[PDB]
Each structure stands twice: as C-alpha cells, then as structure tokens.
Amino acid sequence: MDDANKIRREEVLVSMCDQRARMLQDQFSVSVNHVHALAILVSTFHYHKNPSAIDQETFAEYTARTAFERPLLSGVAYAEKVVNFEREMFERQHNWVIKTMDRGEPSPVRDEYAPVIFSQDSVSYLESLDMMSGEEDRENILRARETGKAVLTSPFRLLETHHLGVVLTFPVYKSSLPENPTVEERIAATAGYLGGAFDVESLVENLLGQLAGNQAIVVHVYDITNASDPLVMYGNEEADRSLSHESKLDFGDPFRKHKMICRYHQ
Amino acid sequence: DDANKIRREEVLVSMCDQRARMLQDQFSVSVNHVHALAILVSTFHYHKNPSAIDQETFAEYTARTAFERPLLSGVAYAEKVVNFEREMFERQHNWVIKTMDRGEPSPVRDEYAPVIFSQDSVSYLESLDMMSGEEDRENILRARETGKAVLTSPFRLLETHHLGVVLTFPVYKSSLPENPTVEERIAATAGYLGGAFDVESLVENLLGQLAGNQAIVVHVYDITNASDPLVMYGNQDESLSHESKLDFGDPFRKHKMICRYHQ
Numbered sequence: 001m002d003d004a005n006k007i008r009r010e011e012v013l014v015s016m017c018d019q020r021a022r023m024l025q026d027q028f029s030v031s032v033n034h035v036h037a038l039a040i041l042v043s044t045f046h047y048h049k050n051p052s053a054i055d056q057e058t059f060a061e062y063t064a065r066t067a068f069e070r071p072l073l074s075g076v077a078y079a080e081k082v083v084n085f086e087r088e089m090f091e092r093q094h095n096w097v098i099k100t101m102d103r104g105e106p107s108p109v110r111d112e113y114a115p116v117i118f119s120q121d122s123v124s125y126l127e128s129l130d131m132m133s134g135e136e137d138r139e140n141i142l143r144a145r146e147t148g149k150a151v152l153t154s155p156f157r158l159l160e161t162h163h164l165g166v167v168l169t170f171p172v173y174k175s176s177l178p179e180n181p182t183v184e185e186r187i188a189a190t191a192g193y194l195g196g197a198f199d200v201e202s203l204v205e206n207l208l209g210q211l212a213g214n215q216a217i218v219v220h221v222y223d224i225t226n227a228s229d230p231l232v233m234y235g236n237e238e239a240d241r242s243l244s245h246e247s248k249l250d251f252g253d254p255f256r257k258h259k260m261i262c263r264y265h266q
Numbered sequence: 267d268d269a270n271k272i273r274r275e276e277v278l279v280s281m282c283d284q285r286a287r288m289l290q291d292q293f294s295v296s297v298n299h300v301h302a303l304a305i306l307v308s309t310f311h312y313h314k315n316p317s318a319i320d321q322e323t324f325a326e327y328t329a330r331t332a333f334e335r336p337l338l339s340g341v342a343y344a345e346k347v348v349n350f351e352r353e354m355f356e357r358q359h360n361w362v363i364k365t366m367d368r369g370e371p372s373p374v375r376d377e378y379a380p381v382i383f384s385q386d387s388v389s390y391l392e393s394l395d396m397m398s399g400e401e402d403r404e405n406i407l408r409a410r411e412t413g414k415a416v417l418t419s420p421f422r423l424l425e426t427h428h429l430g431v432v433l434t435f436p437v438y439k440s441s442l443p444e445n446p447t448v449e450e451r452i453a454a455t456a457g458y459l460g461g462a463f464d465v466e467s468l469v470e471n472l473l474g475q476l477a478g479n480q481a482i483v484v485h486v487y488d489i490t491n492a493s494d495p496l497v498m499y500g501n502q503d504e505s506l507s508h509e510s511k512l513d514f515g516d517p518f519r520k521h522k523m524i525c526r527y528h529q
C-alpha cells in the first residue's frame with residue numbers, strides 16, 4: 001500500500017532474484033567443471049592407459065559416487081565417435097547394434113555415429129543409443145568437437161523423463177591432436193563426447209523450492225540466444241504483472257544467452 | 267568526518283567481504299575436487315583388482331586437472347603401511363620409506379604413510395612418510411577417524427617453506443562397514459589423499475591482484491584456539507577494522523578474515 005514500502009518491495013525482489021541467479025549460475029558452473037574432469041578422466045584412464053582401466057561397471061561406480069559433485073545433472077555418459085566404415089567392427093566387438101534414440105531401433109546407415117558406451121546408471125537407457133540421432137544432441141556434439149570447449153543445447157525435453165532441460169557436452173580428443181589445432185584437425189582427432197543432462201525442470205525446481213520465501217516469488221529462466229525467439233528454460237502462470245526484475249545468467253557457453261525473470265505471486 | 271566516515275566503513279566491509287567470499291569459494295572448490303580424487307583412488311586402486319592406477323596415471327590426471335584445484339600447490343596419495351608389511355611394501359616399490367626432515371631411512375614405527383602417488387609439482391613427497399611430520403600425522407589420524415576432510419594449523423611446507431595448511435581425505439577399503447565406529451574406520455583405512463594449500467603464495471596471488479589492495483591490510487587467522495590466534499595469511503602485527511566470515515569446511519578448525527585501512 002505505502003509508497004516507501006513499494007520501494008522496499010522492489011529491493012526485496014531484486015535481492016531474492018539476484019541471489020537465486022547467483023546460486024543457479026554457480027551450481028551450473030561447478031557441474032560443468034566436474035564434467036570437464038570426467039572428460040579428462042576418460043582420456044587418461046580409457047584411451048591413454050594401456051590397457052583401458054574403464055569399463056561400464058567402473059564408469060557407473062565412479063560417476064555414482066561423485067554424483068554430488070554434479071548438482072543439477074541427472075546423469076552423465078560417454079559417447080564414442082564411430083564412422084560408418086567402422087560400424088560393423090564396433091558392433092561385433094561390443095556385441096550390440098547402434099540404435100536410434102527416437103524408438104531404440106537399429107540405426108539406419110549414416111556417415112558417422114555417437115553411440116553411448118559408458119553411462120551413469122541414472123541414464124543407463126542411453127547405452128548403445130546414437131546421440132547424433134537427436135537434433136539437439138547432434139548439434140551439440142558438432143560444435144563441441146569443432147570448438148574444443150563445453151557447449152549447451154537449446155532447452156528441450158529429455159529422453160525417458162520428458163523433463164525440460166538442456167544437454168552439456170565436452171569433446172574428447174585423441175593424443176594425435178596437434179597443438180593450436182584447426183577445426184579440421186579437431187574433427188579428425190575426435191575420440192568421443194562426454195555429455196551431461198541438465199534436468200532443469202526437476203532439479204532447478206528442487207533447488208528453488210527449498211529456499212525461503214519461494215511461495216512469494218515467481219521464477220522464470222529464458223534462453224535468449226535468439227532475441228526475437230526467447231525460449232522458456234524454466235518456469236510455468238498467475239503473477240504480478242506490475243513489477244518484475246531481470247537477473248543476469250552466464251552458463252559458460254558463448255554461443256548461448258540466458259536470463260532470469262522474477263515477479264511476485266501477486 | 268563525517269558522512270565520509272560512513273562510506274569509508276561501508277567500503278571496508280564490502281572490500282573485505284568480497285575477498286572472504288572469493289577465498290572461501292576457491293578453498294571449497296579445491297576441497298571438492300580433492301574429494302573426487304580420494305574417490306578416484308578408492309575406485310581404481312582398491313575396488314578394481316588388479317589396481318588400475320599408478321604413478322604415471324596419477325601424475326597425468328592430476329596435472330591435467332590442476333586447474334580444478336586453484337589454491338593447491340599439489341596433491342599426493344600416501345598409503346597406509348603397518349610395520350609387518352614394510353619389507354614387502356619396500357620390495358614391491360623398490361624404495362625405502364623415508365623421514366620427512368632428512369629423507370633418511372625411517373626408523374621402525376608401528377605404521378607409516380609413505381607417498382606412492384604424487385603430482386609432479388610435489389614429486390619430492392614420493393616415498394616420504396607423512397606421519398614423520400607432526401602436522402601431517404595429526405591430520406592423517408583425524409582424517410581416518412572422522413571419515414571426513416581435515417585441515418592442519420598453518421605451518422611451513424616442504425621445499426618451498428611457504429606458510430600454508432594441509433588438506434587430507436581418508437581413503438577406505440571396501441571392507442568398511444556402514445555407520446562404522448572409529449575403531450572400524452581405522453581398521454578399514456587404506457590411505458590418505460592429501461593436498462597442500464600454499465597460502466603464502468597462491469592466496470597472495472589471489473588477493474594481491476585485486477583493485478584497492480594497496481588501501482587495506484588483510485589478515486587471515488586460524489582461531490581454532492581463541493586464546494592463541496595463528497596467522498594463516500598476512501604480517502605479524504598486533505583502529506577501524508572489520509571481521510569477515512570464513513568457513514574452510516573443517517569443524518575442528520575456525521578461521522576469520524580481518525581487514526583494516528593503512529592510515
């Protein structure tokens with residue numbers, strides 16, 4: 001009611017929204033760094049070491065025990081690069097056929113594939129699935145290996161849970177990767193892709209829901225990579241259309257842009 | 267005077283709080299990644315048989331993930347060796363367990379904690395019995411008894427003589443019961459994943475580069491003993507100051523940051 005109270009009413013919204021934005025950004029950052037460590041893990045213990053020290057069992061165990069290191073991630077998995085020329089050989093050795101993600105059926109002929117060979121049990125259904133048979137995942141895989149850095153997809157509904165989230169992807173390179181490599185060289189030296197599923201719908205709601213004063217505030221997160229086409233990353237809704245605040249978000253991928261919008265319930 | 271006194275205070279609080287936050291977050295990040303290393307050793311060295319990790323692999327993985335541990339000068343893994351195992355152990359590694367102070371053959375002890383894995387930045391730790399140093403020894407004991415990360419008091423590290431603190435995680439054998447007793451933890455102890463927080467150098471590099479650093483004096487104290495505050499960072503000096511909170515993760519220890527203006 002009061003006018004001076006309105007000022008403080010905004011100050012509160014600003015503080016609450018900014019804090020929640022910092023928490024989200026930090027938690028995301030922490031998870032990205034540990035996934036990065038997993039990519040290095042696979043490179044060191046699977047490819048560099050002879051013989052490999054990593055099988056599905058080992059990957060499952062280590063990732064499970066370190067799940068607390070990756071908050072906001074529902075699971076991690078490693079997909080290996082497989083060129084069509086190698087497919088038969090790859091499938092005979094693993095004793096299973098590469099499958100599409102849409103139906104889990106034997107994949108048709110493609111130039112290359114990205115089937116998951118290692119997976120955290122939380123996402124064990126990814127095993128043998130070709131990560132390139134999904135458009136979001138395919139684009140992430142390409143940009144990942146071309147840039148040599150972590151990358152994020154647009155928000156989309158994940159496999160099995162259908163939860164709205166985003167996928168994080170790190171490239172894994174063979175030792176043959178030249179220093180100061182070109183994009184062409186990065187592609188030629190690609191071994192595989194370490195991916196993480198950011199279950200935003202479930203895990204972000206869980207983080208926010210526990211915070212004091214949550215019932216009083218409405219929190220929305222947007223992918224604004226495309227100015228004219230903002231994509232809802234999190235949030236549903238009846239709210240206070242008179243006042244709002246925009247908090248800054250940086251999820252680490254220069255190719256994507258995000259922001260948080262907060263309002264009062266009423 | 268006088269409204270400037272207020273701003274002068276508000277600036278000190280803000281400057282000190284931010285430095286404290288930065289310091290705590292960096293420490294926290296380093297601790298979490300050392301925890302992952304402890305888990306890594308458990309899985310690859312003990313859960314897998316034969317062992318699927320060695321000095322070569324440890325050195326590579328820790329070097330490549332060095333960025334993950336901002337305030338650590340290096341990390342290493344010391345394995346638990348009881349005396350009756352010493353001959354076999356030394357014969358297997360082809361070296362003798364050495365003392366920390368002189369690097370001489372260790373006298374007979376009930377047990378030892380020789381480093382078998384090391385990041386090349388602390389390669390000199392290899393074969394050294396971490397129990398032959400009091401700070402390290404106590405850290406090792408409290409680590410395996412509590413089952414959680416532990417920190418030492420500030421003390422000068424090997425080789426560099428830089429003032430800092432050691433972080434230690436316990437690594438347990440699979441034979442560790444759940445909801446175990448201290449006696450059970452000790453019996454299941456496999457080794458100790460340790461890291462050296464080079465405060466004197468790395469913290470200085472962290473804070474000394476911040477804008478306005480020349481205007482304020484910054485101290486970090488180990489106040490585990492209120493009557494005997496230990497300097498962890500800053501000079502050895504005893505009006506307008508401010509105390510910023512610090513939580514390094516070890517309930518056994520207490521810390522605080524103190525910021526003050528020069529004039």
Ligand SMILES: C/C(=C\CNc1ncnc2[nH]cnc12)CO
Binds near residue numbers: 197
């Ligand atoms: C394995 C990798 C990505 C992981 N992607 C996903 N991980 C988990 N669920 C999903 N639904 C759609 N894509 C995913 C490699 O880039």
Ligand SMILES: C/C(=C\CNc1ncnc2[nH]cnc12)CO
Binds near residue numbers: 422458
């Ligand atoms: C390997 C472990 C401790 C590491 N301790 C040290 N690590 C590095 N430099 C030092 N100087 C004195 N002690 C140290 C196990 O707790």
